[PDB]
Design a protein around this ligand. Structure first.
Ligand SMILES: CCc1c(C)[nH]c2c(C#N)c(C)nn2c1=O
Ligand SMILES: [Cl-]
Ligand SMILES: [Fe+2]
Ligand SMILES: [Zn+2]
Length: 340
């Protein structure tokens, strides 16, 4: 299944698309998860929102200015908080001469310009804004209620899932960056690009994730000393030139407005926004995730990082293993290649 581990693009008919959980089972049956990342283009007629005009009025409480330092494919970034502004003000800022997308020939050209210009003007973004902007009543692929095993454990068993299964908005401009990371607890994520300019992605197959970790520890030995899972800080940038040089396998793809990207457990991803845009995302889980969550290597640094107790998931979905697990005896290494 997908021996190349390349990013797959899916084009479901309305009939296939209707049921998210079933279609996701189908994607993995084709080996989509080997790449760490997949794209799903919904059928043309499907619209999660009739009109986006009102989103201009939404407030972005804490826009962040992204300060990047380093050189030649290896960078670290930190955040400066700016004053609140409406999406409309943010779009006008994004479109100004100081912040707008440069002229470019094709995506390959724009990508070169991204990596060449990272340490000049510092771009601004709004992230982790709570809420979904789907219309009421949209029942397909509704990011606010995907009904995965996360939801079951929360609603049926009353277990806190720490807010990770709720929907968040991101408002990008040119050159705003998501640094290399896997999801909290090595969950899945889903990202829909509502409107605006594209978002480019890089992804490393989960089966090669440890090689990215070893390369990062080698280039960022300071960061590494402070925290065993320092890539979860989302402050570490590493270019595809550097990946190619040290032979870490990866793939790239660009997401356009109206398209979904799914990231899979332990699928390291990074990327950047082409221009002003708006994306909605959340985390979710399936049963195949449970063995990733049990071994996910967590940040020790700060007091507040997301940790979900695995107890309920092993007890309910892996009852055969539960006591072995609680006795520290459930030892395995994950097969990243097979469906569950
Ligand atoms: C620059 C704002 C921003 C952040 C911080 N992270 C992410 C992810 C992730 N993961 C993606 C898909 N987009 N996105 C963003 O636009
Ligand atoms: Cl530029
Ligand atoms: Fe992510
Ligand atoms: Zn940490």
């Amino acid at each position: 299944l997908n021996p190349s581990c390349k990013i797959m693009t899916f084009r479901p008919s309305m009939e296939e698309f209707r049921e998210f959980n079933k279609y996701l089972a189908y994607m993995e049956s084709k080996g989509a998860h080997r790449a760490g990342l997949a794209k799903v283009i919904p059928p043309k007629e499907w619209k999660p929102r009739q009109c986006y005009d009102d989103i201009d009025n939404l407030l972005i409480p804490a826009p962040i200015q992204q300060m990047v330092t380093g050189q030649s494919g290896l960078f670290t970034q930190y955040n400066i908080q700016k004053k609140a502004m409406t999406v409309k003000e943010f779009r006008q800022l994004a479109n100004s001469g100081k912040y707008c997308t440069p002229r470019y020939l094709d995506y390959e050209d724009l990508e070169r310009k991204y990596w060449k210009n990272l340490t000049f003007v510092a771009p601004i973004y709004g992230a982790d804004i709570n809420g979904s902007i789907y219309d009421e009543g949209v029942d397909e692929w509704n990011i606010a209620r995907l009904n995965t095993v996360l939801d079951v454990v929360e609603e049926e068993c009353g277990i806190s899932i720490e807010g990770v299964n709720t929907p968040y908005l991101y408002f990008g401009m040119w050159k705003t960056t998501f640094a290399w990371h896997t999801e909290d607890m090595d969950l899945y994520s889903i990202n829909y690009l509502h409107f605006g300019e594209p978002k480019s992605w890089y992804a490393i197959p989960p089966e090669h994730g440890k090689r990215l970790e070893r390369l990062a520890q080698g280039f960022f030995p300071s960061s590494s000393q402070g925290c065993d899972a320092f890539l979860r800080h989302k402050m570490t940038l590493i270019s595809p030139s550097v990946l190619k040089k040290y032979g870490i396998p990866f793939d790239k793809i660009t997401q356009e407005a109206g398209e979904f990207m799914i990231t899979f457990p332990y699928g390291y991803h990074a990327g950047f926004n082409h221009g002003f845009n708006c994306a909605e995302s959340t985390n979710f889980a399936t049963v195949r995730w449970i063995d990733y969550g049990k071994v996910a290597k967590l940040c020790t640094c700060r007091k507040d990082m997301v940790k979900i107790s695995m107890d309920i998931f092993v007890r309910k979905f892996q009852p055969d293993r539960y006591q072995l697990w609680k006795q520290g005896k459930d030892i395995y290494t994950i097969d990243h290649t097979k469906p569950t």
